[PDB]
Amino acid sequence: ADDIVLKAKNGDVKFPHKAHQKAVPDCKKCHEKGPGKIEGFGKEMAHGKGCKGCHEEMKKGPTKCGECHKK
Ligand code: HEC
Numbered sequence: 001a002d003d004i005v006l007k008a009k010n011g012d013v014k015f016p017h018k019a020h021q022k023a024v025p026d027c028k029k030c031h032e033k034g035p036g037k038i039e040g041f042g043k044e045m046a047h048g049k050g051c052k053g054c055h056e057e058m059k060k061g062p063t064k065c066g067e068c069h070k071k
């Protein structure tokens, strides 16, 4: 399957899966979540534990606005 781009208005956000499969061997951090996670995602999650917060906790991954968002 292909990577996905989140169409944030301030700039597309790429999500590269291969880098996540390799760096986050705890696949249940994202997979096998109960129902609601597709509908639940949005800006609050992305700037929180959905994206940025995990990077902050794992001490690796982009944490600045222009590292995630790129037109
Ligand atoms: C959240 C940060 C995730 C982590 C950690 C892992 N995966 Fe994942 N996976 C996630 C997304 C949003 C998607 C779909 C979008 C995409 O970019 O592909 C996937 C997809 C998969 C698939 C399909 C990949 C493909 O067919 O090319 C598989 C089999 C899957 N993911 C496996 C998987 C494994 C085993 C993980 C841990 C080592 C892993 N993922 C972590 C989000 C995230």
Ligand code: HEC
Residues within 6 Å of the ligand: 013, 014, 015, 016, 019, 020, 023, 024, 029, 030, 046, 049, 050, 051, 052, 054, 055, 058, 060, 061, 062, 067, 068
């Ligand atoms: C932990 C459970 C994570 C979640 C949820 C998300 N990401 Fe992540 N990301 C994680 C790690 C530990 C890393 C390091 C990968 C590396 O080897 O450098 C990253 C990295 C990225 C990258 C940069 C990838 C690269 O090859 O340099 C990007 C662009 C990225 N992550 C984006 C991203 C977004 C948009 C997320 C939510 C949709 C997301 N990450 C979730 C750990 C975790």
Ligand code: HEC
Residues within 6 Å of the ligand: 006, 007, 008, 009, 010, 013, 041, 042, 043, 046, 047, 051, 052, 055, 062, 063, 064, 065, 066, 067, 068, 069
């Ligand atoms: C990657 C880990 C991110 C970092 C660092 C920042 N943002 Fe972000 N933001 C991210 C995602 C995945 C999303 C899309 C959410 C979704 O609904 O899919 C966003 C969203 C925003 C938005 C809202 C855009 C819209 O609703 O169309 C804005 C205005 C935004 N982000 C701004 C922003 C700024 C200024 C940041 C630095 C302070 C920043 N983001 C960091 C992913 C990431």
Ligand SMILES: C[C@H](CCC(=O)O)[C@H]1CC[C@H]2[C@@H]3CC[C@@H]4C[C@H](O)CC[C@]4(C)[C@H]3C[C@H](O)[C@]12C
Residues within 6 Å of the ligand: 004, 006, 015, 029, 030, 031, 033, 037, 038, 039, 040, 041, 042, 045, 049, 050, 051
């Ligand atoms: C559930 C995990 C981890 C965050 C958390 O614990 O909530 C998060 C991390 C990244 C999230 C995905 C980002 C890309 C997609 C954003 C869409 O708008 C909703 C579906 C997708 C496929 C999201 C589904 C789910 O919300 C995920 C896989």
